[PDB]
């Protein structure tokens, strides 16, 4: 439901998501981290299953921001994977993957894993 | 300047990705999957690091395809991030993670993991 | 701390494990999973570190089940990475990837990744 | 049954796994990186699958090293987490998590995740 999705969500860190969702499956918004070498909003871009399954499932959707804006470029990219599930108590529950810019020597240690769980604030 | 992101890519698995690098850091195109529950081509759209290090870096980047067109919607997303390595045989290096929609009692086992590495051969 | 790590701690999903920490930093015990292609216990292994930071850092550690045992076989391995955080709430905190063996078409989806989080119960 | 994983395996970083798989599921061996805050050899234990399909499946495998020995402790461990393909040309294929230990407040950056291959060349 692109309504659902649609909104400012919280993750876990104190990170700010705004998100809007497109009737063609376009996910556009800024994204602000409490944590890091970011500073002010960034630009994001998804994508996210605009016709899910009628059952109890999820809602597939991604999105990444690349942490340069007008005031701190921090040579990394971060995309989330995960799934939206809606209700009262809406979520959206991630895992992402944070790449760094680095030479080919220290490309093994260019990228974390990690998890967050946003919650929905009244839209 | 230098960014020679934009074109056509491989991955080892066959699939196609066909990407234009926006000169403020947007990645828009089109990706054809050679394996799972795909199609014909779907819609891209990702960021990457516009102003990247004068050091000897890679470029930072990432993007998204939710498996949903005309043809086929297998409630699932994945996310490629990675990094951009120029030169006389450029390469995108990435890791992905697919997520599948599931109900709450699968989401234990709702995303897989993998690697793909990009060259434009 | 082999003796803050060694007991028995069960997880988010109702799985349960049981471990010993080793003087050497070798972990040992067993299994027991709530859910998947599991039943009973199973054999784990695994390493920590034995002379962790003497600040507030948690103890980095790892281990290991492949899911096999006497009344059943999933051909698939899970590792755990993560660390355990001391206290009086202490709490091993996880990621994971569980690989199935596949065909060599179909490697591309072996890899399961998720995070569980491991409660301690009273030793 | 011919699960010749035991002996002495190479990654493309130039890294060195001695390993020796037992009958009934254990892995034990050495380990030395040549990355990282590493130096000589380090100890593993893991666990694979000694009764694998039939068909034309690879054999499920998984191991951990604690990065301290009798030079170094680096505060980290690694899992590697793969499956071991025999042949003519045996690889082992795997992806791995190195878990840093880390207060509290840096926990969200406590864990990198790569990708290894093990060839016995
Ligand atoms: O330090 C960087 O390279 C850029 C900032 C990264 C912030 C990360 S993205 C994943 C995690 N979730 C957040 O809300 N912030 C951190
Ligand atoms: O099966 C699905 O759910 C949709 C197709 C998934 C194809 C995946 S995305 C990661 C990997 N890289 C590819 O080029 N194809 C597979
Ligand atoms: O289905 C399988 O192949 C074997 C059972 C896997 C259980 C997984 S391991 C990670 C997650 N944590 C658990 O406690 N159980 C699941
Ligand atoms: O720096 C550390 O914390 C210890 C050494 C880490 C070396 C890693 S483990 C994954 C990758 N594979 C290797 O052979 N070496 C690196």
Redesign the interface.
């Known amino acids: 439901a692109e309504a659902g999705i649609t909104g400012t969500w919280y993750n876990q ?1 104190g990170s700010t998501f705004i998100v809007t969702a497109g009737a ?3 996910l556009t918004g800024t994204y602000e981290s409490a ?2 070498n970011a500073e002010s909003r960034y ?11 009628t ?14 804006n007008n005031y701190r ?1 921090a ?9 939206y ?1 809606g209700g009262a108590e809406a979520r959206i ?12 020597a220290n ?9 967050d769980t946003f919650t929905k604030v009244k839209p």
């Open positions: 860190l063609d499956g376009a944590v890091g630009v994001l871009t998804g994508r996210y299953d605009s016709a899910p399954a059952d109890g499932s999820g809602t597939a959707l991604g999105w990444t921001v690349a942490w340069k470029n040579h990394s990219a971060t995309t989330w994977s995960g799934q599930v529950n991630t895992q992402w993957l944070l790449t760094s810019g680095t030479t080919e490309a093994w240690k260019s990228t974390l894993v990690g998890h």
